[PDB]
């Protein structure tokens, strides 16, 4: 079931996340958020997203579009449960894109993130991963741990004039 | 009559904006502006209002609310036009407020202006002035003027933490 997604400005968004137990995520509230998440998240048309957009405060992430509407040109990105991630750059490169978040409807704005990254984290099943991450992916998974740190996009802009509103700054 | 407000990301809004010379503002033409702007800012409930955000990139400003809904706070502001004007602050001291811009929709940031500064400028007479203006207006007029160098709030915004979406903010 599709959930409130909190818009910037309300303070949860700035709030740390907790991490999530090996036991919690047996839980059958658990379940029922990565569900009412996902749900949530194909309806907004989003390619991740963060419980604390939902207003939980959990270390919780799920990702996945696939023929994305709102971001057109954007490869497919299979569905997964990113839980507790920890991620270090392992560059400095970095590939710009106009960011969007659905804490911030209606606007994007350019980003510039590295383009590979190592994510260390558990899903669903508890399983440990430790990875490195690059092209689009590692920008979706920067961005969503950004929200479990209380941090949107917004504060990582590169030039506050390479912002502003979809329909416009599609011409 | 009311023309339309260009919203952040359009690029007009980020140009330069040139001076009205003396003759101009005889022609049948500025008299029009005028009074499209003043009609387009009262409509809005506006405060204030900068040629480039209905697309001229003039050195035009007007100003006057009285009782704004937007900004419920905020004293009056006679109606004045400022022409070709040139601030320059004469404090440090600032006196923080949560602005907004007619050219970003349902939005609001955190900016703290110079509370005390010089301006000079020429009325729709041609008219020179050179006061020092404070309080409210001193906000209203930086505010109005960077449009005219192609400047937004957002350029000036004190901390992303603080902005947002008006109907969030007010929580
Ligand atoms: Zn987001
Ligand atoms: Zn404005």
Redesign the interface.
Known sequence: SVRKI?????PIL?KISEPVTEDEIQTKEFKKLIRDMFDTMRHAEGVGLAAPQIGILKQIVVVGSEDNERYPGTPDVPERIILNPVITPLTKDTSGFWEGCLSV?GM?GYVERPNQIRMQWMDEKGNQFDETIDGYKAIVYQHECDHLQGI?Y??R?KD??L???????DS
Chains 1, 2 share one sequence.
């Open positions: 909190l818009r910037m400005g309300d700035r409807p994007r949107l917004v504060d802009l506050t004039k912002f502003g509103f979809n329909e416009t700054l």
